[PDB]
Amino acid sequence: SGSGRGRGAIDREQSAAIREWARRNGHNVSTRGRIPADVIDAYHAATLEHHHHHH
Protein backbone atom coordinates (compact mmCIF):
# COMPACT_ATOMS: atom_id res chain seq x y z
CA SER A 1 0.00 0.00 0.00
CA GLY A 2 1.04 3.66 -0.66
CA SER A 3 3.90 5.09 -2.82
CA GLY A 4 7.08 3.07 -3.66
CA ARG A 5 9.43 1.70 -6.41
CA GLY A 6 6.42 0.26 -8.37
CA ARG A 7 5.88 3.81 -9.86
CA GLY A 8 8.85 3.04 -12.22
CA ALA A 9 10.28 6.63 -11.99
CA ILE A 10 14.06 7.31 -12.46
CA ASP A 11 16.34 9.77 -10.52
CA ARG A 12 18.65 10.80 -13.47
CA GLU A 13 15.63 10.54 -15.84
CA GLN A 14 16.99 13.31 -18.17
CA SER A 15 19.01 10.38 -19.70
CA ALA A 16 15.91 9.65 -21.88
CA ALA A 17 15.82 13.33 -23.03
CA ILE A 18 19.59 13.20 -23.92
CA ARG A 19 18.97 9.85 -25.78
CA GLU A 20 16.07 11.48 -27.70
CA TRP A 21 18.18 14.62 -28.45
CA ALA A 22 21.06 12.39 -29.71
CA ARG A 23 18.58 10.42 -31.94
CA ARG A 24 17.04 13.72 -33.28
CA ASN A 25 20.61 14.92 -34.17
CA GLY A 26 21.63 11.49 -35.72
CA HIS A 27 24.39 10.94 -33.05
CA ASN A 28 25.45 7.48 -31.72
CA VAL A 29 23.74 6.53 -28.37
CA SER A 30 22.71 3.28 -26.57
CA THR A 31 18.99 2.29 -26.24
CA ARG A 32 19.26 1.61 -22.43
CA GLY A 33 21.61 2.29 -19.45
CA ARG A 34 24.36 4.99 -19.30
CA ILE A 35 25.20 7.62 -22.01
CA PRO A 36 28.83 8.65 -22.96
CA ALA A 37 30.02 11.86 -21.22
CA ASP A 38 31.09 13.21 -24.66
CA VAL A 39 27.38 13.09 -25.75
CA ILE A 40 26.22 14.63 -22.41
CA ASP A 41 28.79 17.42 -23.09
CA ALA A 42 27.48 17.63 -26.72
CA TYR A 43 23.91 18.07 -25.32
CA HIS A 44 25.12 20.75 -22.81
CA ALA A 45 26.89 22.61 -25.68
CA ALA A 46 23.61 22.61 -27.70
CA THR A 47 21.51 23.88 -24.70
CA LEU A 48 24.08 26.54 -23.56
CA GLU A 49 25.86 27.86 -26.71
CA HIS A 50 22.93 28.12 -29.25
CA HIS A 51 21.92 31.48 -27.56
CA HIS A 52 25.59 32.64 -26.93
CA HIS A 53 28.00 31.66 -29.83
CA HIS A 54 25.46 31.30 -32.75
CA HIS A 55 23.31 33.49 -35.11
UniProtKB/Swiss-Prot annotation:
<comment type="subunit">
    <text>Homodimer. May form higher oligomers via protease-activation.</text>
</comment>
<comment type="function">
    <text>DNA-bridging protein that has both architectural and regulatory roles. Influences the organization of chromatin and gene expression by binding non-specifically to DNA, with a preference for AT-rich sequences, and bridging distant DNA segments. Represses expression of multiple genes involved in a broad range of cellular processes. May coordinate global gene regulation and virulence as well as genes important for adaptation to changing O(2) levels. Protects against reactive oxygen intermediates.</text>
</comment>
<protein>
    <recommendedName>
        <fullName>Nucleoid-associated protein Lsr2</fullName>
    </recommendedName>
</protein>
<feature type="region of interest" description="Disordered">
    <location>
        <begin position="1"/>
        <end position="14"/>
    </location>
</feature>
<feature type="DNA-binding region">
    <location>
        <begin position="32"/>
        <end position="37"/>
    </location>
</feature>
<comment type="similarity">
    <text>Belongs to the Lsr2 family.</text>
</comment>
